[PDB]
């Protein structure tokens, strides 16, 4: 009846790769930090694509300026845990100059305490989400990684265990037809035109969906991701133009503050067609507001909504409402969470392959031993390693802009 | 890097009872109301039955003690066991040994959430969403957390992401708040003795009773009323307003648990700043969503009644999403290892098992060996620093095994 | 002007047949306590069918563990009444160890008093429905049976008389086409696939409906029973996929706690198509909540919602709203009620025949002289016997696990 | 087993009146307001007409006594009769003898609900849902229950499922509550004498009048105000708040019965814990649904006005479903045999037919032979233990038969 003995945390450190102060196209934790000729930068509709200079490329307006934050927590026994997110150099500042004070000297089991202190202390400048929240998440995930690594358990077991033997995935990218051949259950395509394109824009994105429906058959799901680029009327028209092809859902039509627009969009959705959002929302209380709009599925990003600790709360909010939660695809950081969620029957795999024809690891190259779906699935046994089961690729050129103590 | 801890499968589940109608009455243990003569807990307490002359003086008389204590023990293949107790007794053993065993045996000790979902899904046709069948499910869920914490060598509070406070502070429930202040509790909750059929006299008596404790206890020590489902909206509103001058902090469970619409109206009519609370008899996370939506200030599930620790953690996230507190019905260690991790449970309940509320008789006395009690109305996290829920089963109690399999 | 003299109740006794502690497939009061090769166990969608081990058979997850409760009340003149429900051995415990105290020594006319005492006294563990409520119902029905048997009147006459000369039935089972040939007005089929089956599942259950529509013509009703197995989005899609075949209603799509989901499902239903539920709800106050969701028809089970005394209140709640009530089919216990309800224009007959080709009595074999519809109807004259007009088949092997006094 | 009681058919229905504009004024009986000179019931009572100088002092002056008493008697083929009385007189006999007879004659004595539905369906084009035609229907429905109880040899209260209390306690309605306390009543309800046209003086007078009775009656004896449809929301709110300091329990019928929206607002503006009640002039169960939905605390149908005992039992279930009380307008035995069976009617009304409220003159004096009166503000169930509604018709009264058929 002798309790396992636990170390205190000795050090936290932060590095970054890519972003505006290192090397363009570093990939890793910042999905959009890619090179030339990538589907993910191919005329994707956004709040800026209405501007001729920023229509063809999201990189051009700066989708890639942040790069990847890496947070590593070191216990007094020299065991480490870490995690990666989008924030880069500014995230380093926050961790090294502010948050380190709540982290260092706590018990490795003090995760929810540190998470609470981190939210309480940054509330005056975090704005609910975005950069600061991504940084908090990255710290939360490192803490879980360390705690599992010290205990010798996968995070999914610390959470109360898998509720299914494998995760099934849909794939996000320009090639649902190729994804069907790889064994995925569905494909989510980006929209390429926006409100300023009017009926032509609706015609083109609907024709894209109609084409893939013909290529993929009736049972493979199709979805559109709209990345905050629309307004209520354009989204309504687009959803109705795609209804004949059984589009499963239409995602992130509006900027995240537009809760009232989401409520109106869901009311106007075609019967049976779901409306989703959440990947840019942050904090449990924001997801309360989002859920009450009546959207079918919230899609938090673990690396952005506040971390694993927040994600688990969001899952319970959804469950309380008899609804699914389907987190954005965040490799192992989402895998260990969703395989324990009875109300996450499937998950997302984002194509980082430039032409969506191969299975590049999602956070390539920053994670060593990073799993990829095989036949559209990741077996729970693949996740049976301590923490989130990966190691940091120290061959990437990690920059340390700040230090402390 | 490291290979995981190897975890055993679950080999056996077994169920026993003590007390209740088919054994020795007054056993105590998991059923708080399985007590002897002259207990404050049976002293003319207002109930849905107290309108009847024959059932007015005693709750025991209408049968509040018929069920007794259910004990569930789960045994891993490596011979380690975990256990828990709740109110369900003999019928509880039937549900465990003849139904739920099929979902428990042969699973991993980490498959807690999986088993939980299977128990809810398989009993949905007979569970009524709360009460006896839910108590049984809850008791199994707690046994599983116990066993898992014991196999791992960690207190459940650490597997949940750790304490967010170094100790738990307690208010005390029973007839002597004046005395509880002397034992160091932060407040005291009294039962009501009169009901709607007692009219204005009932209100005057119970309010007088509170006026007296404010006087004896000073202005800062909390006073509350527990109404055990015994009122209607009008009577409850009259009471709350009659008690407002004494700064009564909350008024608890005025209505039967189905009366959601009535709680909404009661909350709307409550004196400014006085809380209306409920939840001890609710079960299932979805019932708690409907509860939370009535606008009541505090939900109060019993961990061993609401569905288990797995459900309690969900109810906590639901309340936290709404910016509200969650304050479980005092369930000894089963609550302690939870509430110590909840940012939104700033205090907890100790329910007086002492006949005259003068002593710190343990919450689940005599069934739990080494059961912590509030030391100066506080319980420090070090006390909780033992594997699982940190207690042992008292096998000197006369455990009966009505069923096997 | 000399009033009929009435006996007091002398004894109540409880037996069970079937369930986990007697013989598999006992049938009788537990509809699902059947053998192998039965339509009613044929890949029926449920909250558990998402689990590969519990997909093909409801028996496999334990739909049949309870078996049949029999409650017999004996008056001091030695006249008996009785009734049957689903609860078995645990129901015996409740009746023999708890409820007997409110029952024994009352007047045979004291039905609503005993019913109130039974609800008031079990409120702390009944959870609103399910097992405990089924047991209360069984006692309520026995009391009505005895009272009518003593007076020498059918229950339907004690209630204020028939409002129609016969009851017309739809049939529930896998063969609406066979039911049409037997003279029923409609057939309600179970769904076989659930949310985890996606578009394929919708395609298959809709094709089942389309096939029967072709076989049965336009005026014979078709309905689907979904037995708590869906979520809002899947139910919406299924209802719209069946609208072209004029599906009359879609029943029990959601678990009974999901009132808010019912409200959203009814809003999204195809024009003219009804959404129904209620067979797993218990207590008058639960049916208030259910009615206010806007569902078209509540479908209480007399043996489960609290008894005849509660059923009659539910009928009035429906009537107050200008709506029908259509109780689940519970043989004579529903017949004597619904033939007096102006707002129950038709009733349900459940096929206990394994292949739905013959008219086995619904509670076969526990009831002697149990009527069956002839040409889809039961003439009121068939019900013109005292109480509920049947006798207990004492040749079944009734077990008495408990006794008292 | 047993052959049923053989029941006769209904052979004749016959209708008589006394009192009212076409006979001897001041007859009393079923019409409570058919009284002589100097009655408290006609003493400057506030009404919708009292704003007019000519109709201010007397209700008799505007014609509250024009209708008189309707008597319906139903005769079975075995020569047994049952009867009831209500307010409708001569026009009432026209409706019975020239319309409703066709639904009554030739039915079974048990066909109560059937006849009831037929009477509502057939008069829907001229009934206005309350008032005169509803009174007539109600009187027939009561005659049928009477006749049935008499043929069977049971009090109606036993056919309804029996008493849920051994006696009925009563508050008294009239000008001398101080005196009613002395007769043992649990409270007293006073009429208002002034109306909106009297402004602040009106309020001061009626409030003063209540301040005086609190003083004379002590704090525990209930005080209430009846406003007989005579106010508007603003005047009613001013009154309630002027009476709050005297713990006035409820304020009754402030508004004409159509003003549902106004009752909703009045209830919203009422002092905390003070009830707002209504319903005496409502008719049809659907009107009561709309009433209940305004949020008023207590609905108060008159049994002989609201549609009959059949409707009253429905209104009771509606209130009970909402967790609320139902307290009929005192209708002597017609209410007593109902309310004694309603869990949600914990007290009843005795309306003073005594000119100066000093004596226990019977409610329907002189038309009912052996009419019970509260013995010490209570009426025991043994008093009710006679067949049907337990009274006889006073044929010494000068019964007129305006119509036959
Ligand atoms: Na997205
Ligand atoms: Na409580
Ligand atoms: Na059903
Ligand atoms: Na009145």
């Amino acid at each position: 009846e002798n309790i396992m003995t636990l170390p205190k945390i000795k050090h936290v450190r932060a590095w970054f790769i890519g972003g505006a102060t290192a090397e363009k196209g570093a990939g890793g934790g910042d999905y959009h930090d890619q090179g030339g000729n990538h589907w993910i930068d191919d005329h994707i509709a956004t709040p800026m694509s209405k501007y001729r200079d920023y229509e063809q490329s999201r990189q051009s307006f700066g989708i890639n300026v942040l790069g990847t934050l890496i947070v590593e927590v070191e216990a007094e026994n020299r065991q480490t845990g870490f995690a990666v997110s989008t924030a880069g150099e500014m995230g380093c500042f926050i961790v090294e100059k502010h948050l380190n004070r709540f982290i260092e000297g706590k018990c490795v089991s003090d995760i929810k305490l540190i998470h609470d202190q981190m939210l309480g202390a940054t509330m005056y400048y975090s704005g609910s989400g975005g950069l600061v929240m991504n940084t908090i998440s990255c710290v939360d995930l490192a803490l879980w990684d360390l705690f599992g690594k010290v205990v010798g358990l996968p995070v999914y077991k610390l959470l109360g265990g898998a509720v299914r033997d494998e995760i099934q995935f849909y794939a996000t990218g320009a090639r649902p037809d190729l994804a069907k051949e790889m064994g995925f259950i569905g494909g989510k395509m980006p929209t390429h035109w926006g409100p300023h394109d009017g009926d032509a824009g609706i015609r083109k994105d609907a024709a894209m969906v109609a084409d893939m429906r013909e290529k993929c058959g009736p049972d493979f799901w199709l979805m559109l991701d709209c990345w905050m680029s629309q307004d209520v009327n354009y989204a309504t028209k687009l959803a109705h133009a795609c209804a004949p092809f059984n589009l499963k859902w239409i995602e992130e039509c509006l900027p995240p503050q537009q809760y009232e627009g989401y409520r109106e969009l869901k009311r106007n959705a075609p019967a049976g067609m779901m409306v989703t959002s959440g990947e840019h929302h942050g904090t449990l209380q924001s997801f309360r507001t989002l859920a009450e709009t009546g959207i079918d599925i919230m899609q938090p990003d673990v690396g952005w909504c506040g971390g694993l600790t927040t994600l688990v709360e969001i899952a319970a909010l959804a469950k309380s409402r008899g609804q699914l939660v389907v987190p954005h695809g965040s490799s192992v950081y989402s895998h260990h969470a969703v395989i324990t969620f009875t109300n996450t029957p499937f998950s997302e795999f984002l194509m980082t392959s430039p032409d969506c024809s191969t299975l590049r690891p999602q956070f390539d190259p920053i994670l060593l031993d990073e799993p990829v779906p095989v036949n559209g699935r990741i077996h729970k046994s693949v996740l049976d390693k301590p923490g989130f089961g990966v190691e940091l690729n120290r061959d990437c050129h990690l920059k340390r802009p700040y230090s402390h103590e």
Side-chain angles (χ1 to χ4, degrees), chain A residues 188 225 251-252 279 328:
Chain A
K188 178 169 82 186
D225 187 327
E251 159 169 345
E252 212 183 12
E279 86 176 41
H328 191 70

Side-chain angles (χ1 to χ4, degrees), chain A residues 128-390:
Chain A
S128 281
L131 171 62
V132 180
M133 200 62 47
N134 293 2
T135 302
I136 292 180
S137 310
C138 197
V139 177
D140 189 73
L141 289 172
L143 296 165
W144 278 106
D145 190 45
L146 178 57
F147 186 35
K149 282 171 172 171
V150 165
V151 170
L153 279 182
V155 168
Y156 84 84
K157 291 177 170 166
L158 292 175
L159 287 182
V163 304
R164 61 181 59 76
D165 294 331
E166 65 187 16
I167 304 164
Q168 295 183 61
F169 287 92
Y170 69 97
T172 302
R175 297 296 298 277
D177 57 337
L178 303 184
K180 186 176 174 263
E181 304 170 1
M182 303 167 217
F184 287 97
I185 71 189
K188 178 169 82 186
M189 290 162 286
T191 57
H192 295 272
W193 309 96
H196 52 281
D197 298 302
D199 297 298
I202 295 169
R203 155 168 343 107
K204 295 183 223 156
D205 279 325
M208 172 182 71
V209 173
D211 178 62
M212 288 298 161
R213 171 63 64 218
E214 189 270 312
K215 286 174 181 160
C216 292
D219 290 343
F220 181 82
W221 303 341
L222 296 170
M223 297 77 116
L224 288 174
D225 187 327
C226 306
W227 210 77
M228 302 181 292
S229 72
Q230 309 174 165
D231 58 17
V232 175
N233 177 248
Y234 188 84
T236 295
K237 287 169 72 175
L238 177 69
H240 286 265
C242 298
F245 314 111
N246 187 28
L247 188 84
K248 187 178 184 62
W249 74 74
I250 189 172
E251 159 169 345
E252 212 183 12
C253 302
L254 308 174
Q257 301 83 16
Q258 287 180 30
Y259 300 111
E260 295 87 352
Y262 277 110
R263 174 178 288 107
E264 178 65 2
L265 181 58
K266 168 65 174 165
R267 288 189 331 92
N268 280 274
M273 183 179 296
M274 291 189 289
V275 173
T276 74
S277 195
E279 86 176 41
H280 295 100
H281 289 82
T283 80
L284 190 50
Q285 295 72 25
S286 283
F287 282 91
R288 181 274 190 90
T289 300
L290 186 53
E292 293 181 5
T293 70
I295 66 146
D296 299 87
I297 300 175
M298 295 180 301
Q299 293 176 301
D301 183 298
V302 207
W304 309 350
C305 69
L308 175 62
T309 298
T310 304
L311 183 69
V312 167
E313 301 180 325
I314 295 165
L317 176 36
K319 190 175 211 183
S320 80
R321 287 175 63 83
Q323 292 174 324
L324 308 183
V325 60
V326 182
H328 191 70
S330 302
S331 200
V332 296
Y333 309 106
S334 53
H335 306 337
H336 279 253
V338 304
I339 201 162
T340 81
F341 291 162
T342 60
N343 65 322
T344 306
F346 56 87
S347 188
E348 175 183 30
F349 177 75
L350 173 96
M351 278 295 150
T352 55
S353 171
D355 70 341
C356 298
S357 70
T358 69
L359 289 162
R360 183 176 173 211
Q362 160 102 52
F363 282 156
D364 183 72
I366 198 53
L367 264 31
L368 304 174
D369 315 318
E370 191 181 355
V372 299
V374 174
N375 188 225
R377 287 145 149 104
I378 294 182
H379 200 270
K380 49 180 198 243
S381 68
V382 173
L383 304 175
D384 249 48
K385 280 193 271 248
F388 296 107
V390 295

Side-chain angles (χ1 to χ4, degrees), chain A residues 67-115:
Chain A
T68 296
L69 171 64
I70 294 130
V71 170
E72 175 190 88
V73 175
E74 192 191 342
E76 86 204 344
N77 71 347
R78 307 170 55 99
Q79 298 196 272
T80 56
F82 77 105
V84 301
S85 194
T86 298
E89 172 167 335
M90 307 190 267
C92 296
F93 178 108
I94 295 166
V95 171
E96 298 265 10
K97 302 288 159 188
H98 184 194
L99 302 181
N100 68 296
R101 86 189 57 187
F102 314 107
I103 295 157
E104 278 162 353
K106 298 275 207 316
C107 180
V108 291
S109 71
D110 283 332
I111 297 171
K112 310 199 294 191
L113 183 46
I114 300 165
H115 190 253

